[PDB]
């Protein structure tokens, strides 16, 4: 049944509009929890705002709105209405009471603008406050400048300036995150035309003490940029400021002298620019409302210090450990990239903030609809069962609010399942939550007999899907497929057919007792092994090359380990990244080693979640390099999983190579060094980590009494 | 240097007091970051409030304040001043403008009450609003009732009612957290003397549909408790309400009809009582300010739903998975126990909230100052080095704000170190952050030769401390101590001397090349093995029985695993908890097994952090049972670590028993079943989890070319 309707206005005084919140100004009857989040975007060219808008802001916004999954042309079903009103070209022609009249004239304003968001994106001006004298009815406002009189907390939205309108940021211009300490401990540049005076004297004295390398400037070389009253105006051009910030461990941001100025375009620009190049922001003044602060824990990316504690800032900056400081820089890069960096970022964030505030789940991430190549086949006791999907829509939107917004990958997509589902406590399977659980010995445990009879573990039973990439290797494919006949817990085999030429019509595919789905590929890419094929109906994927020889016992043990390490790559070929001491860079190393940091996906388990991330969220430059060299997709997936988890992979059994006994250049090996170092440039840091152990079954090589059996014969 | 002083008042209008925030009303010059957080508590018996106070509130508050580590009698050094003003006995004799005059008369009010917190704790009344007509100067207010006009967000504090004044809650009366689903999906009891009417009709229709078992009552059997206008008054007595809530999966809380009533004592009592017995709160009305909401992510413990979405509540409650619902119940127990349950909880929370808001670290957790028993001794190349301490004071207070408050153990103590310090990315050790790092092969890696020469890993080098408990076993003690001679990375051996009788004067302790510190125990307890002895100068503890035989290679491998699993018990004797199918309870099981859930601390590594938690934070009832049976401290530590981490332990090597080859009842074994099931009652759930693997060195049992060596000879 529909949510209860908000009673509209039948003109409302300024005190009434300042009291708008979701609980009294939003019409939930337009937004059932299960109806998606349809968004109507007004075309600003049909209204007075269009011709006064900054042209780059308008163009970038229109392009993002056209590409957005939530946007509908059907106003009668929309939950949210979006109007872009600025920023406007300077000098601002349009008068305020006029802006108000055109808002109230919008096609679907109804009496009061309920369920509207007014978006006003900064780019070139730091003095605009377009809506100050404007009654906004029941609409929300999203912009970078607010005085206290106008900001409605939990209702309005503080957003990022739109810097890269109709451009793309170049990540290769971002300084590496390591070394932690840069030339200057901190810097500041500004000019101002209460506590201000002590701040200046304190910071000047830090510089004069020569206890650290700092650069603080309280005038600009040339004329400062125009600003609001009491603001530390920006100096120079963006390119000048960034050159210093790239050399700064920390960037000071001194909030405006007037405490009523909650946030300004100029302040938000200082934040943007510091985060863009890894200078950890140090914000003096707690009265500030940073962009998206209702959703983001800004203390993880920025020091936000009261102005009276300016006398302690030097000590504080010197007291942070390298690992804590690096974590702050890494978090700043995540926040900046995800929520600030592009028009897509900003629009996605506005919509996700409103959607999340009204408890609606994100749109489901897309998948690879596969074209099956039907084929003919040649000549435990239950049939395949799929993993259940979309069981946590509300939990992952609302209950998991902190991680959804403050941990990669962010809040924009709904996945069918993830590796981070909480485990039930171990008594629940016996006391009412036992569906699908298969405890060893019915809960009494046991030795190898009981162990082989039941998956056990801490989660219900499930199956896995083999994904096998093939190209021009038809004979070896049929044979390795035949090796899967009889494999326990196998749901199906997905064969990714990369060759331009289709499978010969006269082909007898082995009957292995589960479906073999051959999927056609629009192009020939190693990246296709990590596409989230529609045909994969499990969470667990066993990724295997068409020439890998794994025994069934090895696969079964790997599966059981993965079921207890669901966020990891769990697999057989362990490798590591080696430091090239003279060249100060990385090398790929596949020697026998006591320490590992990668498990190759030519023989490994991982969660389907990472197929979605690899394919649709991870930077395009990584997939492009994989296709340039036809190499390194295994390295790329290890980078991705270790970035998300901050853990090494898990290596299973004493196996080192995994091809056939009888089965088989240098340039390919050197490409892997180049991949590793390029991926580090894309990420900004090396995410791989080392492990000094492998996993074996509990009773491996253990001498047992006669009434006990090993978990496995050989592993 | 001191923080900048706030300029005082030289009477201030209501608009001014409603604008108080930390940035304009708090004097940071009284609170340097490094001066602790000294708190002065007024004795309310010296002021008019004392004789009007509720006597149980006053008595419980005074007792907590007397026992508090922050409280000082020296007003000239205090950062914060605390005055208890209520709740008052009914009918309220004292008039408002009078309350105001006595506040302004407090000894250290100065002109305006800056740096004061006025505490008004509810217990018996739901109609009091003592400070409504009271000017509070620059003081903060902590209470359970606020209208919008009076609540200053980020400055005032919404707190819990004081239910157990001068009593202790009995955890054995709390229903177990499992089964997830209880008799009633949801319940509500209230009576009210806008959206209200649709809520009633919607919920009545859910009950009438008989699609779930629910019990919703909108009148009380007898006269309802007095309440504020538009509130759903409480029914009956606390004992009546709890009896129904114990049978409720979810508890509805319908917020007051008047949106200006931000929170009330009655609403906060409904929250308290639901959380007390595991009913997951479903709060209808988002305008509410729940207790401690600035610090706590309430969505993790409660569904907070707009009143218009009442028509979707039934669907929502039915859509939550068992594991998500159980996680919400578990989080509610943590929040309730830590911040609501006792006067200590509430006072600790008020002080910690203010302290955290002004960026000051918690007081350091105490330690066991040891009495060394000096002794005489009988007859890699560097000397012992201690682990560094207190490197994250600001980070763990401010940057880690989310986890500090929303994850066990909570925010009240500062530890010297913890197992959750973020790791540096793997290039940082080569590019400026390398102090203490010992990479294998200088970063090039290698095989067993290179591996034995360097700890490697992802953290700098460190040492470990052996902790060995002994009692009446003097001969075997000298011998097992001698087995530690030559052990790499050993900092020292702490011998915990439990026997009432001291060590014979004529005793020659072996010289093993590191200090042997023998510590005297005030009493003979197994719990003493987990005291955070002053003498332990490392993070890593190797806990070993006086009769355990470990080889040096085993210890070294275990240490390397622990260095990469620092939050886990990493050790040798693996055991598990078995379900007793007919009795629906747990058993201790030490058979050979393919699945483990405990590693016994008679031979295991763990972080000193858990010694502090075990000794000083974990429930006393667990330590009491250990002393009653002289048993089960190993089980207790596994419960603790798996509760904190939600992970199983890690078992190292194929060893099952760990006593001497030649070395050695039933009642002791049956005590372990009783311990396991009692500990489950204390926690509310079983925290142990299963693992189906052990760890071995990477090249264990691996065939190698001649130019490569195994990491270890035997493991
Ligand atoms: C098993 O374990 C062993 C031991 O670690 C490991 O051997 C090492 O292998 C690496 C990589 O192949 C070697 O590093 C390279 O050294 C190059 C110079 O090597 C000479 O000198 C050593 C002794 O000093 C001799 O033993 C050796 O035989 C050679 O005569 C050096 O040029 C390489 O640097 C390339 O890559 C880095 C990026 O990290 C880049 O910065 C460099 O510039 C260089 O790239 C080249 O750039 C030029 C232009 O600038 C360009 O023209 C050229 O195309 C680029 N590409 C190359 C390939 O040069 C690198 O440092 C190391 O010496 C070996 N050590 C030993 C003791 O042999 C095995 O590789 C491991 N086996 C497996 C299968 O993993
Ligand atoms: C290695 O692995 C084996 C296989 O799992 C395991 O053997 C099991 O051991 C457990 C525990 O010792 C046994 O469970 C107990 O069974 C009791 C009855 O057992 C009889 O029946 C079986 C066949 O049915 C016979 O084989 C057996 O020899 C006996 O004749 C049962 O009474 C026990 O229950 C106690 O504990 C629960 C708490 O979980 C409690 O609820 C019970 O009430 C009972 O407590 C007793 O209460 C009474 C009053 O109510 C009180 O007077 C008394 O003092 C209390 N204490 C006891 C001890 O009774 C429990 O269910 C199980 O039968 C064994 N299985 C087999 C196949 O033998 C080994 O223990 C493992 N070895 C190691 C070293 O781990
Ligand atoms: C959690 O979110 C997912 C994803 O948004 C929801 O899945 C979607 O559910 C709807 C309704 O069941 C599906 O639409 C329906 O499709 C069927 C065909 O099977 C059609 O007959 C219906 O008339 C309707 O169009 C939709 O396909 C499905 N989306 C996906 C990607 O599976 C799910 O319902 C949500 N669960 C809860 C409990 O809220
Ligand atoms: C992080 O917090 C810890 C714990 O509060 C701080 O440790 C404390 O530091 C003070 C000042 O150094 C110590 O007091 C001093 O003791 C020395 C004796 O060594 C004495 O000569 C001085 O006059 C003064 O009284 C205090 O003992 C110490 N506490 C503990 C438990 O070690 C630490 O300083 C903080 N670190 C940072 C960077 O803020």
Numbering used by the authors:
A (entry chain A), B (entry chain A): 154 to 163, 168 to 350, 374 to 559, 579 to 863, 869 to 919
Cite, word for word, the article reporting this structure.
The completed linker tetrasaccharide represents the point of bifurcation in GAG biosynthesis: either EXTL3 adds an α-linked GlcNAc and initiates HS polymerisation or one of two closely related CSGALNACTs adds a β-linked GalNAc and initiates CS polymerisation. Structure-function analysis reveals that acidic residues in the glycopeptide substrate and a basic exosite in EXTL3 are critical for specifying HS biosynthesis. Our results demonstrate that modification with CS occurs by default and must be overridden by EXTL3 to produce HS.
In order to explain these data mechanistically, we determined crystal structures of an EXTL3 dimer lacking the coiled-coil (residues 154–919) in the apo form (1.58 Å resolution) and with UDP and Mn2+ bound (2.10 Å resolution). The large dimer interface features an intermolecular disulfide bond (Cys793–Cys915) that staples the C-terminal tail of one subunit to the body of the other subunit. The activity of these EXTL3 mutants was assessed with Tetra-BETA and TetraP-BETA as acceptor substrates. Mutation of Arg905 and Arg907 reduced conversion of TetraP-BETA to product by ≈60%, and mutation of all five basic residues resulted in an almost complete loss of activity. These effects were even more pronounced with Tetra-BETA as substrate, indicating that both the phosphate and the acidic residues in TetraP-BETA contribute to EXTL3 binding.
